PDB file of all heavy atoms in Angstrom:
ATOM      1  N   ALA A  49      12.544   5.650 -27.410  1.00  0.00           N
ATOM      2  CA  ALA A  49      13.511   4.744 -26.773  1.00  0.00           C
ATOM      3  C   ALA A  49      13.008   3.321 -26.717  1.00  0.00           C
ATOM      4  O   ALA A  49      11.823   3.083 -26.688  1.00  0.00           O
ATOM      5  CB  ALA A  49      13.844   5.229 -25.337  1.00  0.00           C
ATOM      6  N   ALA A  50      13.936   2.390 -26.613  1.00  0.00           N
ATOM      7  CA  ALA A  50      13.650   0.956 -26.502  1.00  0.00           C
ATOM      8  C   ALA A  50      13.386   0.544 -25.065  1.00  0.00           C
ATOM      9  O   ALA A  50      12.569  -0.304 -24.824  1.00  0.00           O
ATOM     10  CB  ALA A  50      14.794   0.186 -27.001  1.00  0.00           C
ATOM     11  N   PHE A  51      14.097   1.126 -24.116  1.00  0.00           N
ATOM     12  CA  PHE A  51      13.960   0.752 -22.716  1.00  0.00           C
ATOM     13  C   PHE A  51      14.664   1.749 -21.804  1.00  0.00           C
ATOM     14  O   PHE A  51      15.313   2.660 -22.252  1.00  0.00           O
ATOM     15  CB  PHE A  51      14.493  -0.661 -22.471  1.00  0.00           C
ATOM     16  CG  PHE A  51      16.008  -0.773 -22.556  1.00  0.00           C
ATOM     17  CD1 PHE A  51      16.765  -1.092 -21.419  1.00  0.00           C
ATOM     18  CD2 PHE A  51      16.673  -0.580 -23.757  1.00  0.00           C
ATOM     19  CE1 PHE A  51      18.169  -1.209 -21.491  1.00  0.00           C
ATOM     20  CE2 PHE A  51      18.066  -0.686 -23.845  1.00  0.00           C
ATOM     21  CZ  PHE A  51      18.820  -1.000 -22.704  1.00  0.00           C
ATOM     22  N   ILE A  52      14.481   1.595 -20.514  1.00  0.00           N
ATOM     23  CA  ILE A  52      15.247   2.365 -19.555  1.00  0.00           C
ATOM     24  C   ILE A  52      16.076   1.397 -18.701  1.00  0.00           C
ATOM     25  O   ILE A  52      15.570   0.461 -18.069  1.00  0.00           O
ATOM     26  CB  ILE A  52      14.329   3.221 -18.689  1.00  0.00           C
ATOM     27  CG1 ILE A  52      13.663   4.306 -19.536  1.00  0.00           C
ATOM     28  CG2 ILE A  52      15.136   3.904 -17.599  1.00  0.00           C
ATOM     29  CD1 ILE A  52      12.454   4.838 -18.894  1.00  0.00           C
ATOM     30  N   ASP A  53      17.374   1.618 -18.697  1.00  0.00           N
ATOM     31  CA  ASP A  53      18.281   0.812 -17.896  1.00  0.00           C
ATOM     32  C   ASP A  53      18.366   1.386 -16.482  1.00  0.00           C
ATOM     33  O   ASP A  53      19.096   2.332 -16.237  1.00  0.00           O
ATOM     34  CB  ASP A  53      19.641   0.815 -18.577  1.00  0.00           C
ATOM     35  CG  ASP A  53      20.491  -0.334 -18.166  1.00  0.00           C
ATOM     36  OD1 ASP A  53      20.359  -0.843 -17.008  1.00  0.00           O
ATOM     37  OD2 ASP A  53      21.330  -0.780 -18.971  1.00  0.00           O
ATOM     38  N   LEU A  54      17.601   0.822 -15.555  1.00  0.00           N
ATOM     39  CA  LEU A  54      17.416   1.461 -14.259  1.00  0.00           C
ATOM     40  C   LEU A  54      18.735   1.787 -13.508  1.00  0.00           C
ATOM     41  O   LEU A  54      18.865   2.831 -12.878  1.00  0.00           O
ATOM     42  CB  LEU A  54      16.422   0.682 -13.416  1.00  0.00           C
ATOM     43  CG  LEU A  54      14.964   0.712 -13.902  1.00  0.00           C
ATOM     44  CD1 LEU A  54      14.097  -0.046 -12.933  1.00  0.00           C
ATOM     45  CD2 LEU A  54      14.420   2.109 -14.078  1.00  0.00           C
ATOM     46  N   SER A  55      19.748   0.957 -13.658  1.00  0.00           N
ATOM     47  CA  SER A  55      21.012   1.208 -12.986  1.00  0.00           C
ATOM     48  C   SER A  55      22.114   1.066 -14.000  1.00  0.00           C
ATOM     49  O   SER A  55      23.090   0.400 -13.798  1.00  0.00           O
ATOM     50  CB  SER A  55      21.178   0.223 -11.828  1.00  0.00           C
ATOM     51  OG  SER A  55      21.314  -1.072 -12.343  1.00  0.00           O
ATOM     52  N   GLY A  56      21.927   1.691 -15.142  1.00  0.00           N
ATOM     53  CA  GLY A  56      22.942   1.704 -16.187  1.00  0.00           C
ATOM     54  C   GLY A  56      23.688   3.021 -16.118  1.00  0.00           C
ATOM     55  O   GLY A  56      23.476   3.813 -15.200  1.00  0.00           O
ATOM     56  N   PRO A  57      24.596   3.265 -17.048  1.00  0.00           N
ATOM     57  CA  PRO A  57      25.453   4.468 -16.969  1.00  0.00           C
ATOM     58  C   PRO A  57      24.615   5.749 -16.817  1.00  0.00           C
ATOM     59  O   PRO A  57      23.599   5.931 -17.510  1.00  0.00           O
ATOM     60  CB  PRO A  57      26.268   4.435 -18.278  1.00  0.00           C
ATOM     61  CG  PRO A  57      26.223   2.970 -18.749  1.00  0.00           C
ATOM     62  CD  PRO A  57      24.938   2.375 -18.180  1.00  0.00           C
ATOM     63  N   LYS A  58      25.026   6.615 -15.900  1.00  0.00           N
ATOM     64  CA  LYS A  58      24.239   7.808 -15.558  1.00  0.00           C
ATOM     65  C   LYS A  58      23.839   8.678 -16.791  1.00  0.00           C
ATOM     66  O   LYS A  58      22.689   9.134 -16.881  1.00  0.00           O
ATOM     67  CB  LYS A  58      24.981   8.631 -14.486  1.00  0.00           C
ATOM     68  CG  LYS A  58      24.337   9.988 -14.141  1.00  0.00           C
ATOM     69  CD  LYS A  58      24.973  10.638 -12.840  1.00  0.00           C
ATOM     70  CE  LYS A  58      24.016  11.689 -12.183  1.00  0.00           C
ATOM     71  NZ  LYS A  58      24.318  11.974 -10.714  1.00  0.00           N
ATOM     72  N   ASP A  59      24.776   8.883 -17.720  1.00  0.00           N
ATOM     73  CA  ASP A  59      24.516   9.644 -18.965  1.00  0.00           C
ATOM     74  C   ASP A  59      23.396   8.996 -19.782  1.00  0.00           C
ATOM     75  O   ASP A  59      22.406   9.650 -20.022  1.00  0.00           O
ATOM     76  CB  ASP A  59      25.782   9.784 -19.866  1.00  0.00           C
ATOM     77  CG  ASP A  59      27.083   9.720 -19.072  1.00  0.00           C
ATOM     78  OD1 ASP A  59      27.496  10.796 -18.526  1.00  0.00           O
ATOM     79  OD2 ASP A  59      27.730   8.631 -18.920  1.00  0.00           O
ATOM     80  N   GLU A  60      23.568   7.731 -20.204  1.00  0.00           N
ATOM     81  CA  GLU A  60      22.589   7.026 -21.049  1.00  0.00           C
ATOM     82  C   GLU A  60      21.163   7.125 -20.471  1.00  0.00           C
ATOM     83  O   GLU A  60      20.223   7.368 -21.212  1.00  0.00           O
ATOM     84  CB  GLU A  60      22.962   5.534 -21.281  1.00  0.00           C
ATOM     85  CG  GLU A  60      23.833   5.218 -22.507  1.00  0.00           C
ATOM     86  CD  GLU A  60      24.735   3.971 -22.337  1.00  0.00           C
ATOM     87  OE1 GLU A  60      24.328   3.010 -21.632  1.00  0.00           O
ATOM     88  OE2 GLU A  60      25.862   3.930 -22.915  1.00  0.00           O
ATOM     89  N   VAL A  61      21.041   6.988 -19.148  1.00  0.00           N
ATOM     90  CA  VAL A  61      19.754   6.912 -18.439  1.00  0.00           C
ATOM     91  C   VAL A  61      19.031   8.252 -18.442  1.00  0.00           C
ATOM     92  O   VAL A  61      17.792   8.316 -18.633  1.00  0.00           O
ATOM     93  CB  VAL A  61      19.939   6.450 -16.941  1.00  0.00           C
ATOM     94  CG1 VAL A  61      18.629   6.468 -16.221  1.00  0.00           C
ATOM     95  CG2 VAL A  61      20.522   5.073 -16.864  1.00  0.00           C
ATOM     96  N   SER A  62      19.815   9.309 -18.209  1.00  0.00           N
ATOM     97  CA  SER A  62      19.314  10.693 -18.200  1.00  0.00           C
ATOM     98  C   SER A  62      18.895  11.141 -19.588  1.00  0.00           C
ATOM     99  O   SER A  62      17.900  11.842 -19.763  1.00  0.00           O
ATOM    100  CB  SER A  62      20.381  11.655 -17.662  1.00  0.00           C
ATOM    101  OG  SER A  62      19.929  12.253 -16.460  1.00  0.00           O
ATOM    102  N   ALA A  63      19.678  10.750 -20.578  1.00  0.00           N
ATOM    103  CA  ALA A  63      19.383  11.113 -21.952  1.00  0.00           C
ATOM    104  C   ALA A  63      18.085  10.436 -22.357  1.00  0.00           C
ATOM    105  O   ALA A  63      17.238  11.044 -23.017  1.00  0.00           O
ATOM    106  CB  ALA A  63      20.531  10.706 -22.887  1.00  0.00           C
ATOM    107  N   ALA A  64      17.942   9.180 -21.957  1.00  0.00           N
ATOM    108  CA  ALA A  64      16.726   8.421 -22.208  1.00  0.00           C
ATOM    109  C   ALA A  64      15.481   9.002 -21.493  1.00  0.00           C
ATOM    110  O   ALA A  64      14.411   9.105 -22.100  1.00  0.00           O
ATOM    111  CB  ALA A  64      16.935   6.985 -21.837  1.00  0.00           C
ATOM    112  N   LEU A  65      15.610   9.382 -20.220  1.00  0.00           N
ATOM    113  CA  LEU A  65      14.486   9.955 -19.491  1.00  0.00           C
ATOM    114  C   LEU A  65      14.003  11.243 -20.156  1.00  0.00           C
ATOM    115  O   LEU A  65      12.802  11.500 -20.254  1.00  0.00           O
ATOM    116  CB  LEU A  65      14.870  10.237 -18.037  1.00  0.00           C
ATOM    117  CG  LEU A  65      15.029   9.008 -17.152  1.00  0.00           C
ATOM    118  CD1 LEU A  65      15.713   9.391 -15.879  1.00  0.00           C
ATOM    119  CD2 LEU A  65      13.683   8.394 -16.848  1.00  0.00           C
ATOM    120  N   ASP A  66      14.952  12.072 -20.585  1.00  0.00           N
ATOM    121  CA  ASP A  66      14.624  13.360 -21.196  1.00  0.00           C
ATOM    122  C   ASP A  66      13.902  13.149 -22.534  1.00  0.00           C
ATOM    123  O   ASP A  66      12.966  13.887 -22.824  1.00  0.00           O
ATOM    124  CB  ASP A  66      15.885  14.270 -21.349  1.00  0.00           C
ATOM    125  CG  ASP A  66      16.402  14.841 -19.968  1.00  0.00           C
ATOM    126  OD1 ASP A  66      15.610  15.011 -19.011  1.00  0.00           O
ATOM    127  OD2 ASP A  66      17.590  15.139 -19.735  1.00  0.00           O
ATOM    128  N   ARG A  67      14.303  12.138 -23.310  1.00  0.00           N
ATOM    129  CA  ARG A  67      13.591  11.720 -24.531  1.00  0.00           C
ATOM    130  C   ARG A  67      12.123  11.260 -24.301  1.00  0.00           C
ATOM    131  O   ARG A  67      11.222  11.699 -25.043  1.00  0.00           O
ATOM    132  CB  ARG A  67      14.352  10.582 -25.245  1.00  0.00           C
ATOM    133  CG  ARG A  67      15.296  10.967 -26.404  1.00  0.00           C
ATOM    134  CD  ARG A  67      15.966   9.736 -27.085  1.00  0.00           C
ATOM    135  NE  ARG A  67      17.205   9.377 -26.401  1.00  0.00           N
ATOM    136  CZ  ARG A  67      17.623   8.137 -26.095  1.00  0.00           C
ATOM    137  NH1 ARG A  67      16.930   7.044 -26.423  1.00  0.00           N
ATOM    138  NH2 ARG A  67      18.785   7.994 -25.444  1.00  0.00           N
ATOM    139  N   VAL A  68      11.891  10.382 -23.302  1.00  0.00           N
ATOM    140  CA  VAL A  68      10.568   9.774 -23.091  1.00  0.00           C
ATOM    141  C   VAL A  68       9.582  10.637 -22.286  1.00  0.00           C
ATOM    142  O   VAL A  68       8.377  10.448 -22.385  1.00  0.00           O
ATOM    143  CB  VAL A  68      10.606   8.345 -22.448  1.00  0.00           C
ATOM    144  CG1 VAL A  68      11.586   7.425 -23.183  1.00  0.00           C
ATOM    145  CG2 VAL A  68      10.962   8.378 -20.981  1.00  0.00           C
ATOM    146  N   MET A  69      10.062  11.600 -21.504  1.00  0.00           N
ATOM    147  CA  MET A  69       9.150  12.432 -20.744  1.00  0.00           C
ATOM    148  C   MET A  69       8.650  13.606 -21.589  1.00  0.00           C
ATOM    149  O   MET A  69       9.416  14.406 -22.089  1.00  0.00           O
ATOM    150  CB  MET A  69       9.804  12.942 -19.455  1.00  0.00           C
ATOM    151  CG  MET A  69      10.286  11.878 -18.473  1.00  0.00           C
ATOM    152  SD  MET A  69       9.041  10.392 -18.103  1.00  0.00           S
ATOM    153  CE  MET A  69       7.430  11.468 -17.527  1.00  0.00           C
ATOM    154  N   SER A  70       7.336  13.720 -21.710  1.00  0.00           N
ATOM    155  CA  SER A  70       6.718  14.886 -22.314  1.00  0.00           C
ATOM    156  C   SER A  70       7.072  16.136 -21.507  1.00  0.00           C
ATOM    157  O   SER A  70       7.589  16.058 -20.404  1.00  0.00           O
ATOM    158  CB  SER A  70       5.200  14.714 -22.355  1.00  0.00           C
ATOM    159  OG  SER A  70       4.611  15.011 -21.083  1.00  0.00           O
TER     160      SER A  70
END
Side-chain angles (χ1 to χ4, degrees):
Chain A
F51 71 114
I52 293 160
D53 201 331
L54 291 183
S55 67
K58 174 168 202 159
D59 333 276
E60 270 151 33
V61 176
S62 244
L65 288 166
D66 288 333
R67 264 182 272 137
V68 310
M69 300 314 305
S70 80

